Design a protein around this nucleic acid. Structure first.
Ligand SMILES: [Zn+2]
Ligand SMILES: [Zn+2]
Lengths: 171, 214, 576, 251, 10, 116, 10, 10
DNA sequence: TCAGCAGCAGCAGGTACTCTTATTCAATAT
RNA sequence: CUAAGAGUAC
DNA sequence: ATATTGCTGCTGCTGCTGA
């Protein structure tokens, strides 16, 4: 999958890539790269799940439906995956690069937040930092969502509090 | 003449929607006139030069027997199409005096672009004659044929009284429909008149609601 | 085991949380939203350290949307009710010809796009053709409107001398420097408008400063010492109006300073007691003593005063420039998530030094003064900045950077001073002020003996460090300052970190490159042009996260949870 | 994200080229997305030009081509070949559109599509009334004309249509033998809402048109249709994450 | 108007 | 466009219509300086700008360690080593085509295929 | 509005 | 008028 | 019977629950 | 009493 | 010597001759 992403990058840099109707060249390139990386992680996770025996305890819990999912097995055993902030890959916080350990204009999967290591194998420092950015996004989203849902729920309940079914079946 | 072709096609669609509106209002319009084909319309209401004519496109309608039995206080109706893009005061005055002298309780005016406010002010004529103005662009597509739009049926006075009696309702306790709603304009609702709305529910097959015009 | 670093006010241990703020004397350009009539705004929060220390914001705004035809640039001078056109400002500073003004703003004759975008300004300002007339125009637009006609000029001159770009100078006779800086600001604004550079990132940690106990107490004492000196005057004038003998003991009032400082440290409200409800709150907090690590993390805490109820998420997100300076996973999890941060283990904050010796060094080493700089005769010249003040230009910046680096690495220049060379932008920025957050790194040199890049530090230095540590548990002591003074390690802040290439580990990245399948997958980066090396990656974590075992085998929110939950752990907080 | 959905006429649902025709018909394109650049030159006489590049263009057009009242100032527009390629536009169409939008007040000529450079030359015809101050601002007048010719005029499509994309959906059509078979159709998704003008475009199915903006649905179709659209939007929100809520609550 | 709800005018 | 300035007071010159000779003129707005017109172009507006993509190239661009290196053919020196960077035009619709500067000749060559 | 969600206006 | 309260006219 | 334009200015912010800490001065007259 | 801060479960 | 007083959300009018 990394080789496929490299080939797509080579085509894009040679301008031979044609833009999808309705978006710019860069957006089409990013869409293709993200799709390839996501399907790579899914395929690796499917291989890992198929390998696991019926006596595997995590497999048993997933089979029962008590706890866990396929994505958890994939991330713990096969590959953590692609880290995203605001629905996009890790942005260039520095000038044209994500971290000062990469060169300028690096669009490779490892440069913009693809974590190819599982949790069992452990994360390299750059992958660790990108994962921290993603987790921070998740925490902020949860903290915003709870307050927004509380406000909306109060307003809805106040609006509809007086609606009742009467004895002629009208509401 | 691609512009002329699109103009005549749009005019034909507008004519079809106007006939459909008049038929739905409860007047005697035969089904054949509604479904008139394009070639027949071009042969009849368009000249040899290709420019459609609007003066002979106007027509008159009368209530049917069932509507007379149900609505015994409504009579003949007149529909007029104008030629000039902006209808002047003189033309509107001729239209209103013709409506008055022909004893029509309702008359629909159709215009190309706009009505000057100097004529908009005199649009409300001497009662009980009511003037309703429509735009051709707004009448190209019959909105009532959209699947989102359910069935609207105007209720008679006796039906409204029975409805309020059976449900023990006051006038204001009914759901409201504005007297500018596109279907309300289509059916010519006046304030105080109740439309029954038949809807295809998904919990029951049929659901009947009611909306009072405001 | 107690580390200090806190005050004892009324028997209570109080710690001053670091306060994050936007850096001063930096030109920042921001795009504006569609509804606003101004499209781009270039602003500088000018402030002088050795003076009134008053904040005066200059905004050079660009009116008109993209599709609009009248695109005029207007500046917002302080104490003026209207946004004066920029060309009027140049004419008031003493630059009458339009050719000179356009030379000051634009540095390239071939850049006809900028001239096309800038012509509406001179078209608008054609009505004024004289310096005295321009000063009269500014006075007429002057918001005071309480001055007679021929005395408006004095008010306009005072505005342009003491309120316009105070960080350059407050004296008279330095109009050319201020005109050059205004041209530079407008040049940056137009570069952003011309779709040549992106709008400045508000979250860039190199554009932020942390006020520690020092500056906070400094500005608090100034207000308190101003009140005392003013009170001496009212007494001196009263005791001189009554014709009585003056005694110094009666004039002074120690309760003023004492009570003000005690109240400001006892309560979070940071200022005067009557100025409460308008002063920042929560600056000083009761020191946490539940556990030792809780005390440490509290003593290394930074707060960002953005609302906390605001619904914007960008200030809270973990920025890229936070690498190695704040802990990636050590934030509170409620409404202060991301707004409250914790320093990394090895990150430091500068205390500030005097910039005059560096200015003397630059003048000695061949910096051309800005007064006699003609861009046409020197097109490819590099602009040199010191603490945000444009001091001149240099024609051979490479040799200048080489000698500055050599001076800083031998101890002649203070290691806290940060020097950045932007080759693409052709700029040289030197910062010495307080508040900058930096970290140490290994320096990598050519090493012609081995023919490849290698760390400057070798086994001899490690042996000397080990010997000194063993003796502590006689030779010349080999401490951290020994490494610093011998040019083995370096201090880099987020600004300088933009212009360097760092190796994550020395073994796998410096030398030119059957593997254990259990080991994690690592890359060689296929590039050898490194300038620095990380001392250890694990130093990106803070005090609370450094307790977690195998944090890189964990999901990140779990690490954040543990960092927050280890401060509630029960143990021995002190031995006494 | 105001978006609109268009369904084609049933008789030509699977006709891909008819879908392309409808997509081109409703999509909004202006000169701003076509013109590469604009220039203002000086020509002493409006028969032979002083620019050698369009000297070939004039030895086509001036050879092909009252002229005593034409301004010496000239406005030149360079277009993009690729923009003329990915969008179904040609030189004659844009020339006709400019001539229509600026009446007779602008003498317009356009390079033929087979020329190496797509060039349009426009002069401001001089009204027979002589002007002493408009001549001085003829540069300014031509700039104003150029400004209202870049963003204020439209080549094709209805307004508020940012971008149209075509998709292949699969609906359930009752087969002539009785069953419900999977029949594919071509459906247009549109950024921007102009329901009143899109609905009347020939070639589409006016009945089945739908919009995310239930306000537009309510103000075009009615209060009942607005209620139905509101329910559909609430249902999409609820079922976006896969949750199921009984009908009566949202109703 | 006002402001709010200058003048009119000015 | 090549805007030029007066040589008497160093003030801007505006284009002007000439009646006697029917030619473009350039006039000063304060001292009335008059001279001929070098070119007929008086106004240029780029909707799609091509220049500025290679902006920022300096004689010592190779001293920047952050810039990536490559061994691609140089069609003026046939050397391998060079520094490469993407387009400097920060418009969001620009292409991802790369630019290369040889560190021994300072010739800029792109990776484009339609251009080549 | 409000606050929150003055007035308007004021 | 004016503007405000062109001309008239222009 | 119709074509062209403008002005301004204002803060709080989901539901419960636990704990700690500090709280406005100085001068004049009876 | 007021104000401020640290929190816990969502 | 002791007590009184100095990010988010909108809202509305005035005016013709000329051509
Ligand atoms: Zn001159
Ligand atoms: Zn070369």
């Amino acid at each position: 999958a990394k080789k496929k992403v490299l080939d797509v990058t080579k085509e894009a840099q040679a301008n031979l890539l044609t833009a999808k109707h309705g978006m710019t060249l860069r957006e089409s390139f990013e869409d293709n790269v993200v799709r390839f990386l996501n399907e790579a992680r899914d395929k690796a996770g499917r291989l890992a799940e198929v390998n696991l025996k019926d006596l595997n305890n995590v497999k048993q819990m997933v089979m029962a439906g008590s706890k866990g999912s396929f994505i958890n097995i994939a991330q713990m055993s096969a590959c953590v995956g692609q880290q995203s902030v605001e629905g996009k890959r890790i942005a260039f916080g520095f000038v044209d690069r994500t971290l000062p350990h990469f060169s300028k204009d690096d669009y490779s999967p490892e440069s913009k937040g693809f974590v190819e290591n599982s949790y069992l194998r452990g994360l390299t420092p750059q992958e660790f930092f990108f994962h921290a950015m993603g987790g921070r996004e998740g925490l902020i989203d949860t903290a915003v969502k709870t307050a927004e849902t509380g406000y909306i729920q109060r307003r809805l309940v106040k609006a509809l509090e007086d609606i009742m079914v009467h004895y002629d079946n009208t509401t | 003449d691609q512009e002329n072709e699109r103009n005549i096609s749009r005019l034909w669609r507008a004519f079809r929607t106007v006939k459909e509106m008049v038929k739905d209002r409860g007047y005697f319009i035969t089904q054949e006139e509604v479904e008139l084909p394009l070639e027949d319309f071009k042969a009849k209401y368009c000249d040899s030069m290709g420019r459609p004519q609007r003066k002979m496109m106007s027509f008159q309608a009368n209530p049917t027997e069932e509507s007379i039995s149900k609505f015994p206080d409504m009579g003949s109706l007149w529909v007029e199409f104008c030629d000039e893009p902006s209808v002047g005061v003189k033309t509107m005055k001729t239209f209103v005096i013709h409506i008055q002298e022909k004893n029509f309780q309702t008359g629909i005016f159709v215009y190309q672009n706009n009505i000057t406010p100097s004529a908009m002010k005199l649009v409300p004529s001497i009662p009980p004659a009511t003037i309703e103005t429509f735009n051709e662009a707004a009448l190209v597509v019959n909105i009532t044929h959209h699947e989102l739009v359910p069935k609207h049926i105007r209720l008679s006075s006796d039906e409204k009284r029975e409805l309020l009696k059976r449900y023990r309702l006051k006038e204001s306790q009914l759901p409201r429909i504005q007297r500018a709603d596109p279907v309300a304009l289509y059916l010519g609702l006046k304030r105080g008149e109740v439309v029954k709305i038949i809807r295809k529910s998904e919990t029951s097959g049929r659901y009947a609601s009611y909306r009072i015009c405001m | 085991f107690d580390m200090g670093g806190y005050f004892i006010i009324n028997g209570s241990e109080k710690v001053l949380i670091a306060q994050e703020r936007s850096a001063g004397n930096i030109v920042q350009v921001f795009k504006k939203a569609a509804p606003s009539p101004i499209s781009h705004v270039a602003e500088i929060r000018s402030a002088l350290e050795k003076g009134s220390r008053f904040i005066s914001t200059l905004q050079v705004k660009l009116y008109g949307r993209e599709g609009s035809s009248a695109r005029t640039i207007k500046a917002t001078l302080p104490y003026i009710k209207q946004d004066i056109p920029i060309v009027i400002i140049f004419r008031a500073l003493g630059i009458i010809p339009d050719g000179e003004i356009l030379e000051h703003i634009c540095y390239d004759v071939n850049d006809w796009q900028m001239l096309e975008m800038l012509k509406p300004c001179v078209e608008d300002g054609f009505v004024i053709q004289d310096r005295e007339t321009a000063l009269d125009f500014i006075g007429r637009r002057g918001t005071a409107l309480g001055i007679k006609k021929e005395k408006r000029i004095q008010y306009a001159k005072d505005i342009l001398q003491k309120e316009f770009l105070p960080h350059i100078t407050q004296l008279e006779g330095f109009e050319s420097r201020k005109a050059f800086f205004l041209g530079y600001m407008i040049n940056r604004l137009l570069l952003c408008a011309l779709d040549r550079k992106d709008q400045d990132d508000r979250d860039h940690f190199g554009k932020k400063r942390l006020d520690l106990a020092g500056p906070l107490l400094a500005q608090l004492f100034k207000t308190l010492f101003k009140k005392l000196t003013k009170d001496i005057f009212r007494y001196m004038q009263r005791t001189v109006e009554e014709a009585h003998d003056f005694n110094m003991k009666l004039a002074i009032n120690a309760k003023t300073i004492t009570s003000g400082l005690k109240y400001a440290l006892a309560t979070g409200n940071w200022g005067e007691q009557k100025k409460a409800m308008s002063s920042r709150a929560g600056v000083s907090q009761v020191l946490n003593r539940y556990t030792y690590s809780s005390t440490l993390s509290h003593l290394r805490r930074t707060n960002t005063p953005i609302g906390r109820d605001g619904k914007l998420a960008k200030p809270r997100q973990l920025h890229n420039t936070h690498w190695g300076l704040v802990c990636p996973a050590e934030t509170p999890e409620g409404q202060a998530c991301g707004l409250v941060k914790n320093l990394s283990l090895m990150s430091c904050i500068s205390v500030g030094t005097d910039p005059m010796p560096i200015i003397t060094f630059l003048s000695e080493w061949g910096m051309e003064p800005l007064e006699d700089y003609v861009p046409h005769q020197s097109p490819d010249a590099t602009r040199v900045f010191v603490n945000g003040v444009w001091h001149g230009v240099h024609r051979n910046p490479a040799r200048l950077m080489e000698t500055l680096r050599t001076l800083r690495r031998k101890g002649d220049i203070n290691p806290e001073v940060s020097m950045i060379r932007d080759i693409r932008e052709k700029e040289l920025k030197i910062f010495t002020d307080a508040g900058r957050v930096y970290r140490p790194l290994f320096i990598v040199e050519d090493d012609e003996s081995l023919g490849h890049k290698e760390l400057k530090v070798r086994k001899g230095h490690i042996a000397k460090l080990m010997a000194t540590e063993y003796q502590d548990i006689d030779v010349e002591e080999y401490t951290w300052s020994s490494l610093l003074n011998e040019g083995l390690v370096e201090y880099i802040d987020a600004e300088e970190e933009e212009s360097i290439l760092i190796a994550m580990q020395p073994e796998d990245l410096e030398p030119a490159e059957d593997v254990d399948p259990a080991k994690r997958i690592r890359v060689s980066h296929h590039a050898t042009t490194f300038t620095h090396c990380e001392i250890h990656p694990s130093m990106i974590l803070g005090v609370a996260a450094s307790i977690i075992p195998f944090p890189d085998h964990n999901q990140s929110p779990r690490n954040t949870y543990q960092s927050a939950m280890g401060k509630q752990a029960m143990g021995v907080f002190l031995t006494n | 994200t105001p978006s609109l959905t268009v369904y084609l006429e049933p008789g030509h649902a699977a006709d891909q080229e008819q879908a392309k025709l409808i997509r081109s018909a409703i999509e909004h394109t202006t000169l701003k997305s076509v013109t590469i650049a604009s220039e203002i030159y000086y020509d002493p006489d409006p028969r032979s030009t002083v620019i050698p590049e369009d000297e070939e263009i004039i030895q086509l057009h001036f050879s092909l081509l009252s002229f005593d009242q034409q301004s010496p100032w000239l406005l030149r527009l360079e277009l993009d070949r690729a923009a003329m390629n990915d969008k179904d536009l040609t030189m004659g169409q844009v020339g006709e559109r400019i001539k229509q939008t600026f009446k007779n007040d602008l003498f317009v000529i356009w390079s033929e599509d087979n020329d190496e450079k797509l060039i349009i030359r426009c002069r401001v015809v001089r009204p027979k009334s002589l002007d002493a101050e408009t001549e001085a601002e003829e540069d300014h007048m031509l700039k104003k004309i150029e400004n209202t010719m870049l963003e204020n005029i439209t080549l094709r499509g209805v307004e508020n249509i940012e971008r149209v994309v075509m998709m292949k959906y699969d609906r359930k059509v009752p087969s002539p033998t009785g069953e419900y078979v999977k029949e594919p159709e071509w459906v247009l998704e549109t950024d921007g809402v102009n329901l009143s003008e899109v609905m009347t475009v020939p070639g589409i199915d006016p009945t089945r048109i739908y919009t995310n903006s239930f306000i537009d649905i309510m103000e075009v179709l009615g209060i009942e249709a607005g209620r139905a659209a509101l329910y559909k939007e609430v249902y999409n929100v609820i079922a976006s994450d896969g949750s199921y809520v009984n009908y009566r609550h949202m109703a | 108007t006002x402001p709010g709800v200058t003048x009119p005018g000015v | 466009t090549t805007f030029r300035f007066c040589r008497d007071c160093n003030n801007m010159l505006y284009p002007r219509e000439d009646k006697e000779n029917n030619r473009l003129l350039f006039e000063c707005r304060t001292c009335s300086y008059v001279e001929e017109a070098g070119s007929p172009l008086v106004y240029r507006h780029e909707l799609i700008t091509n220049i500025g993509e290679t902006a920022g190239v300096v004689q010592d661009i190779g001293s920047d360690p952050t810039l990536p290196r490559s061994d691609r053919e140089c069609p003026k020196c046939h050397s391998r080593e060079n520094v490469f960077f993407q387009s400097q035009q920060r418009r969001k619709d620009t292409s991802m085509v790369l630019f290369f500067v040889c560190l021994s000749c300072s010739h800029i060559f792109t990776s484009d295929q339609k251009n080549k």
